[PDB]
Design a protein around this motif. Sequence first.
Motif, PDB file in Angstrom:
ATOM      1  N   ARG A 278       2.508  66.840  -9.951  1.00 59.58           N
ATOM      2  CA  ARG A 278       3.122  65.613  -9.470  1.00 59.58           C
ATOM      3  C   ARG A 278       4.236  65.917  -8.486  1.00 59.58           C
ATOM      4  O   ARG A 278       4.784  67.011  -8.484  1.00 59.58           O
ATOM      5  CB  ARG A 278       3.727  64.837 -10.633  1.00 59.58           C
ATOM      6  CG  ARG A 278       2.735  64.208 -11.606  1.00 59.58           C
ATOM      7  CD  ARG A 278       3.496  63.628 -12.817  1.00 59.58           C
ATOM      8  NE  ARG A 278       2.610  63.051 -13.820  1.00 59.58           N
ATOM      9  CZ  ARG A 278       1.894  63.758 -14.696  1.00 59.58           C
ATOM     10  NH1 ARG A 278       1.945  65.091 -14.704  1.00 59.58           N
ATOM     11  NH2 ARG A 278       1.116  63.122 -15.563  1.00 59.58           N
TER      12      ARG A 278
ATOM     13  N   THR B 185      -5.633  66.899 -17.830  1.00 64.37           N
ATOM     14  CA  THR B 185      -4.327  66.234 -17.909  1.00 64.37           C
ATOM     15  C   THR B 185      -3.149  67.199 -17.785  1.00 64.37           C
ATOM     16  O   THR B 185      -2.051  66.809 -17.389  1.00 64.37           O
ATOM     17  CB  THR B 185      -4.194  65.354 -19.169  1.00 64.37           C
ATOM     18  OG1 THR B 185      -5.259  65.663 -20.067  1.00 64.37           O
ATOM     19  CG2 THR B 185      -4.312  63.881 -18.798  1.00 64.37           C
TER      20      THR B 185
ATOM     21  N   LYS C 242      -2.461  68.446 -13.765  1.00 67.62           N
ATOM     22  CA  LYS C 242      -1.881  67.471 -12.864  1.00 67.62           C
ATOM     23  C   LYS C 242      -0.573  68.010 -12.298  1.00 67.62           C
ATOM     24  O   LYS C 242       0.345  68.322 -13.052  1.00 67.62           O
ATOM     25  CB  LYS C 242      -1.644  66.144 -13.597  1.00 67.62           C
ATOM     26  CG  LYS C 242      -2.904  65.336 -13.943  1.00 67.62           C
ATOM     27  CD  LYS C 242      -3.533  64.673 -12.720  1.00 67.62           C
ATOM     28  CE  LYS C 242      -4.569  63.605 -13.105  1.00 67.62           C
ATOM     29  NZ  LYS C 242      -5.155  62.904 -11.891  1.00 67.62           N
TER      30      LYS C 242
ATOM     31  N   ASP D 253     -10.265  64.927  -6.695  1.00 64.76           N
ATOM     32  CA  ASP D 253      -9.426  64.281  -7.708  1.00 64.76           C
ATOM     33  C   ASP D 253      -8.830  62.986  -7.126  1.00 64.76           C
ATOM     34  O   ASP D 253      -9.085  61.897  -7.655  1.00 64.76           O
ATOM     35  CB  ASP D 253      -8.334  65.240  -8.243  1.00 64.76           C
ATOM     36  CG  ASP D 253      -7.566  64.674  -9.466  1.00 64.76           C
ATOM     37  OD1 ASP D 253      -8.127  63.859 -10.226  1.00 64.76           O
ATOM     38  OD2 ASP D 253      -6.396  65.060  -9.678  1.00 64.76           O
TER      39      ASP D 253
END
Length: 254
Positions: free
Chosen positions: A148, A143, A146, A60
């Motif tokens: 973070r 999406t 993900k 990724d």
Amino acid sequence: VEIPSSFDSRKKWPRCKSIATIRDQSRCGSCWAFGAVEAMSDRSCIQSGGKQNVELSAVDLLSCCESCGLGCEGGILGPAWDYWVKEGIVTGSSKENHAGCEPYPFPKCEHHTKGKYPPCGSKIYKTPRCKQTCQKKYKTPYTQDKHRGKSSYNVKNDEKAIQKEIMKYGPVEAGFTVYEDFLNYKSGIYKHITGETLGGHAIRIIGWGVENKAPYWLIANSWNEDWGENGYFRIVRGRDECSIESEVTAGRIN
Ligand SMILES: *[C@H](CS(=O)(=O)c1ccccc1)[C@H](CCc1ccccc1)NC(=O)[C@H](Cc1ccccc1)NC(=O)N1CCN(C)CC1
């Protein structure tokens, strides 16, 4: 209160299985990306009290980060971690584990040593395309997978600062200069004596100790469990050995 003479991240958070994991970057110069996703997987586990039991995808980051350098040809540490914050990284295990959203596409191999896996040789693969879709059988949207962080930072070129940073928040990524004699390391506390420069390598520092008076960083390489001291190596701490205390980069989930 202070800094112990020895510390090992595996010993403080042994519930966090990623800390003790050694990866293999394969016939690809993706070290920069691995030490990133490794430290991040460790730190997500550590910082959320265990709730974030995930293995982040080297591919990724390696293929989708557009401001991180040259993919299999070499990458920048700082932006990698910035990518983790703004854009995030999905899950993905290794090729022969086949797990997560975007698992690694390259198989394990031997880096300058004889082992179980087929020898790496010297060919380098083309940087994979940026997928943005998970593997057929992982149903969580790309999406949505993900993960973070909240922040990224350089750590000061400071032995004691690097030590507190590890102890409180987990393993950190760090770059150092590879000189020819590193390619002959088998075990022990590494120091550059001989050889020309070949480039830079990014690895993950997990702790430090001292072997009869001699201070060292405990480092996780990403050339699989066959290379060095079962994957790990040790290098002189305290004297910016090969700039190992200069390129320290990390971040936090909160
Ligand atoms: C990984 C180092 S490695 O694991 O030892 C390795 C792997 C495969 C082949 C050779 C070495 C990569 C290797 C980059 C490379 C690819 C192909 C041929 C020669 C070299 N190294 C990096 O990604 C380093 C990370 C780094 C940055 C800063 C300080 C210390 C380490 N970055 C890097 O090489 N570059 C060059 C490209 N670029 C735009 C800046 C980052």
